Amino acid sequence: KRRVVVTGLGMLSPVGNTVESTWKALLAGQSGISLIDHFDTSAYATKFAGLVKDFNCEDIISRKEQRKMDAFIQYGIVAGVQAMQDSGLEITEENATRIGAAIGSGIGGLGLIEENHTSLMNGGPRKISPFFVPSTIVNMVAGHLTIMYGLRGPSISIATAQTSGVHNIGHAARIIAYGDADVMVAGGAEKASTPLGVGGFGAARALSTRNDNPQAASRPWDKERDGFVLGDGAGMLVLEEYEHAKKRGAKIYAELVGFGMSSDAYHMTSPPENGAGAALAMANALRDAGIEASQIGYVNAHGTSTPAGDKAEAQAVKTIFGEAASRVLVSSTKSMTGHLLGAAGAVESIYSILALRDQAVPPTINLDNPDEGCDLDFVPHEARQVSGMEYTLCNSFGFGGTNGSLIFKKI
Amino acid sequence: KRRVVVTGLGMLSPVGNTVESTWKALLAGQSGISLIDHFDTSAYATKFAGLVKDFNCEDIISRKEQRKMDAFIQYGIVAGVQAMQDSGLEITEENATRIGAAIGSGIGGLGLIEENHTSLMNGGPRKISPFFVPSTIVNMVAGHLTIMYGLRGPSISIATAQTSGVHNIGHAARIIAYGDADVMVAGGAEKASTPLGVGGFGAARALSTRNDNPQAASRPWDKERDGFVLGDGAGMLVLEEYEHAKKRGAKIYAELVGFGMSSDAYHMTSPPENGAGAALAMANALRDAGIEASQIGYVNAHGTSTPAGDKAEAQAVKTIFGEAASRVLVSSTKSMTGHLLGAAGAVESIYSILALRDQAVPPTINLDNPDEGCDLDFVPHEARQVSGMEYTLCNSFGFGGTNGSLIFKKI
Ligand SMILES: C[C@]12C[C@]34C[C@H]1C[C@H](O2)[C@H]3[C@](C)(CCC(=O)Nc1c(O)ccc(C(=O)O)c1O)C(=O)C[C@@H]4c1ccccc1
Ligand SMILES: C[C@]12C[C@]34C[C@H]1C[C@H](O2)[C@H]3[C@](C)(CCC(=O)Nc1c(O)ccc(C(=O)O)c1O)C(=O)C[C@@H]4c1ccccc1
């Protein structure tokens, strides 16, 4: 029976370019949302997003290799290097074969897709870059990291839209627990703040259009919420078999004890009022970890700030938590960070792990006036200290009705 | 210890719109390659591909739901309905929660990506379809099928480029074997025969440009080969826990006994001369199934028809097979079908299963003059009868150096 622990963290987010700076900003209630200035937003209903500030990879990726990568890949590689360095793991000929990666994205390389298509429209196919395919496809972050570190173990990339982060991390764990690997770098990366991303989620009526107050736009469970806020970034964890971790004297952030999956089988872009899929995913993670809902002290919600989605998850938590629903803390960091899509569940799993280490839960900012009829504690406005918290639960849900939940355990 | 069997098959390919018609064409050595006529190829170095002929979904998808889906999704849904019907499984309230899907794609919705981007360039973001995101993203085939059949179990989508088919099928099996599900519809779908797909793989110098003889273009291991041939389609299998299958009187095509993964950690778009990654993936599948290379009677190769790729896999087979290398049969159906990318490993896993049922192996057509120095039997030109074949092995490799191998066992 192989246990899986977390021994390395890496991250780029709209509120910090490292794991610790991001976590600190979150506990301080800082918003990373701002007006977009990299493309003309005049014709766009939504003109703001959670952008990665002053992104720097000069020292990690040549400007030469950079030409072959969409920004999402650059972000994922930087976050993965952060996590690999953080873990302190040394790759050897003996080891190589037992270390792999499970890294995905929800939409992949929109920026270079648009650049190559513009080139084709303007000058014909001869203007398409030789790097079109490898610079835009989802699995390219795992591709570059394995090459960079000489990892020859299993490499997969799960693209389950907004649930990708959670699924890649959960399957990395399954892979290790099954015996196919002893270490996996896992998570997700996304850079969808482009004309097609903003225009596309906007065409669907899914984004907040509160342009006059971008930082107040993301407000999960608030009565005035009007859609999600796009966020860019990457989150990466180094997962590792327990005995392997101890043997090398690794620092252990927490243990990954449960992973649950489910499907809504309801609608392509909306959950059922019931939240029955979200509930099933949580129920499965609890069963997988062998614990009762009452043992969870904090739920890092999917909480995207949409009218129907927030309501469904609140119903799901009430259903799974029952009596303890008032005792469990629930918050949505998307209130500050925006929605990282395929990387959401990866950065949020990190927040869930840090909550265990620091015994402190970040708030749902902007929660001025919560929906009526709900007795859940969404940790409005300010961080909250916790006492003897042993388990946290991270949810991620996605278009296509695909859901996932992870459960982390202290020590 | 839960065993996984295959109880349903579905498929659309350039040589047939059903599983049986496709298999028959393959055993007859028929090419499905033709000149492209749906877009003007004047400026294109490659002007042919393996197209799905007379695709029909009128009776499976309304022309209304169709408007919300890229062709790859339409293909995957039709193949998945074929597999679900073939399995004879009945979905109940009791069952729903235990049936899921693992379906992916390598590039996803290129056609609608291009249509929406053209619309944005011509008329601004207001012209982007509300269906842009859900009509192009990778996980949408699993999304629609779960909704269509009321499946509430685990749903994932692996996007590992040209290895997707094999990885989705292997992880569907892991999911069932772990206990997270009793049935999974799994496979891949692709429709990359578009300006960006043909122009994009063409910019990379990876496609054959033998326009004067499209049907002779795909010629794995042949001295005159000059790159892969793009193919469109979908392959889907219904995987199911053994006891669950027997209990309902399911028809069982074969058993899935081994799944191996590996990474080349070499180059983003080319394997090492050594084929050491391909070898490791095969070695891992053999270990997973608990058998020796000598027990395999047929290898459905990745064999894409590129100068470097074919050579590497031939080296890998020689390495893993050793003495038995001359005794094992190896063929590449891409010689006829073209390269289905994310769906390649899914359709090829089907070919691998049918080879067991019929005791017949399809040929590598166009193999007029094999590379020198290789003593492998690539089954040139004509199908071959086999005698007491108990195991087949299917390989799929992809950009990013990601590899996978599956092993199927008779009965
Ligand atoms: C067809 C509609 C209905 C519509 C507008 C479009 C878009 C969406 O479907 C829906 C939204 C905006 C979003 C529902 C939702 O939360 N989907 C969802 C999800 O299922 C999984 C993950 C995520 C994520 O962001 O990771 C996510 O957003 C809503 O609130 C009600 C509203 C709506 C408007 C007017 C009348 C009725 C309903
Ligand atoms: C940088 C280059 C080198 C180049 C041209 C570009 C494209 C590619 O890389 C390579 C090709 C065309 C393809 C190598 C390959 O098989 N990649 C591959 C793979 O790693 C996994 C899966 C698949 C699949 O199709 O599923 C696949 O194609 C070759 O043969 C030699 C040739 C080349 C030309 C001139 C000099 C040296 C080399």
From Swiss-Prot, chains A, B:
Location of the Ketosynthase family 3 (KS3) domain: 1-410
Top-level EC class? transferase
Q: Where does platensimycin bind?
A: 269, 302, 306-308, 339
Does the entry feature the keyword Acyltransferase, yes or no?
Answer: yes
One Gene Ontology CC term in the entry: cytosol
UniProt keywords, alphabetically: Acyltransferase, Fatty acid biosynthesis, Fatty acid metabolism, Lipid biosynthesis, Lipid metabolism, Transferase
GO MF, one annotated term:
3-oxoacyl-[acyl-carrier-protein] synthase activity
* Matches recorded under Pfam families: ketoacyl-synt, Ketoacyl-synt_C
Write down the chemical reaction(s) this protein catalyses: a fatty acyl-[ACP] + malonyl-[ACP] + H(+) = a 3-oxoacyl-[ACP] + holo-[ACP] + CO2; (9Z)-hexadecenoyl-[ACP] + malonyl-[ACP] + H(+) = 3-oxo-(11Z)-octadecenoyl-[ACP] + holo-[ACP] + CO2; hexanoyl-[ACP] + malonyl-[ACP] + H(+) = 3-oxooctanoyl-[ACP] + holo-[ACP] + CO2; octanoyl-[ACP] + malonyl-[ACP] + H(+) = 3-oxodecanoyl-[ACP] + holo-[ACP] + CO2
Establish whether keyword Acyltransferase is in the entry: yes
Query: In the UniProt entry, which residues are flagged as the active site?
Result: 162, 302, 339
Q: Which PANTHER family match?
A: 3-OXOACYL-[ACYL-CARRIER-PROTEIN] SYNTHASE, MITOCHONDRIAL, POLYKETIDE SYNTHASE-RELATED
- State the remark under miscellaneous: Identified as a drug target. Inhibited by platensimycin and platencin, which are antibiotic produced by various strains of Streptomyces platensis, and by several platensimycin/platencin analogs. Also inhibited by the fungal mycotoxin cerulenin that binds in a hydrophobic pocket formed at the dimer interface.
Give the multimer and partner information. Answer: Homodimer.
This chain's function reads:
Involved in the type II fatty acid elongation cycle. Catalyzes the elongation of a wide range of acyl-ACP by the addition of two carbons from malonyl-ACP to an acyl acceptor. Can efficiently catalyze the conversion of palmitoleoyl-ACP (cis-hexadec-9-enoyl-ACP) to cis-vaccenoyl-ACP (cis-octadec-11-enoyl-ACP), an essential step in the thermal regulation of fatty acid composition. Is able to catalyze the condensation reaction when CoA is the carrier for both substrates.
* NCBIfam families reported for this sequence: fabF, PRK06333.1, PRK07314.1, PRK08722.1
Instruction: From the Swiss-Prot or TrEMBL record, give the protein name.
Output: 3-oxoacyl-[acyl-carrier-protein] synthase 2
Q: Which organism is it from?
A: Escherichia coli (strain K12)
